[PDB]
Amino acid sequence: DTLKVMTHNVYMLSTNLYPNWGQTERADLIGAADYIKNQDVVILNEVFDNSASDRLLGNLKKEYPNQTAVLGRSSGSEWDKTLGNYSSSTPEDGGVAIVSKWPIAEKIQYVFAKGCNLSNKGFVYTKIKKNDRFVHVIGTHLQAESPASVRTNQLKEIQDFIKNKNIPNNEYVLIGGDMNVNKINAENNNDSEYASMFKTLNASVPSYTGHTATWDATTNSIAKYNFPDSPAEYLDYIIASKDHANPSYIENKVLQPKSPQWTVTSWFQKYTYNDYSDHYPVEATISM
Ligand SMILES: [Mg+2]
Numbered sequence: 001d002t003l004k005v006m007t008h009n010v011y012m013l014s015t016n017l018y019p020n021w022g023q024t025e026r027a028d029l030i031g032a033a034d035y036i037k038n039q040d041v042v043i044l045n046e047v048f049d050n051s052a053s054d055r056l057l058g059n060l061k062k063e064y065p066n067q068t069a070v071l072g073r074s075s076g077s078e079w080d081k082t083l084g085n086y087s088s089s090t091p092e093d094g095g096v097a098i099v100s101k102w103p104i105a106e107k108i109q110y111v112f113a114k115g116c117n118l119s120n121k122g123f124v125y126t127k128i129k130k131n132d133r134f135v136h137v138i139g140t141h142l143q144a145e146s147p148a149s150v151r152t153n154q155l156k157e158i159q160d161f162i163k164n165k166n167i168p169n170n171e172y173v174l175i176g177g178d179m180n181v182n183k184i185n186a187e188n189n190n191d192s193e194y195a196s197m198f199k200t201l202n203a204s205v206p207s208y209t210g211h212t213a214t215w216d217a218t219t220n221s222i223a224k225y226n227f228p229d230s231p232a233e234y235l236d237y238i239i240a241s242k243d244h245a246n247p248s249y250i251e252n253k254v255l256q257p258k259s260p261q262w263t264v265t266s267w268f269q270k271y272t273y274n275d276y277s278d279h280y281p282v283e284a285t286i287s288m
């Protein structure tokens, strides 16, 4: 069998702080997009805006009916457990959610202890039954660019959680999302943060295919507006724990899907874009 998992930072900032980023329309464009189809599990990042995020989740309901709540937005029975530094008084939620075409046996949220109370950043854990197999998928979004030291602490909390969970070593355990750890020009430096990421989580390095960056101001219309001169970076991953079932093959493919044109007005000026987010999605293929 093959497991298909995708992760995508969808840039859905709160409309209370950023009213004109086309969040609602992109909720519809992403929901109907072909690139996000045919997956087993999908991890979402930055689904911060409550209305637009729920709209997106609703549009994905037909194909991915099994869904978790958004990390850090609530702490009721919608979560089997709410772990970590969760606060109901944080201005924003963690923006992470997971949807699947398969039954979800357990849903857990965990809020990171440290961070440079702004957003309940952390991770979402899911135990999913796919064809009589239980697979484990953790979705997260780490500290954005001292920042590296914070990310290492967060990665540590993720690894510590996995070990404590007592997951069978013959079942697949994947960790994915916007790690904010750059692979560009770092794949050949055992001392880079990119290298440390794999050590801290004790995960294997996947085969890389597709586009060469996940946040590219040189090809992405949204990133180009916000950071015109910033060199492209590679920050999104989906990797497997070596302390559990090691995939004979695991790929991470960066896609460059373009959306139908959409327009927004900001300060009496109209702007048109053809991207779903400032980040590109990463499609993982895992041989089981
Ligand atoms: Mg972002």
Ligand SMILES: [Mg+2]
Binding pocket: 014, 047, 048, 049, 050, 073, 092, 093
């Ligand atoms: Mg929110």
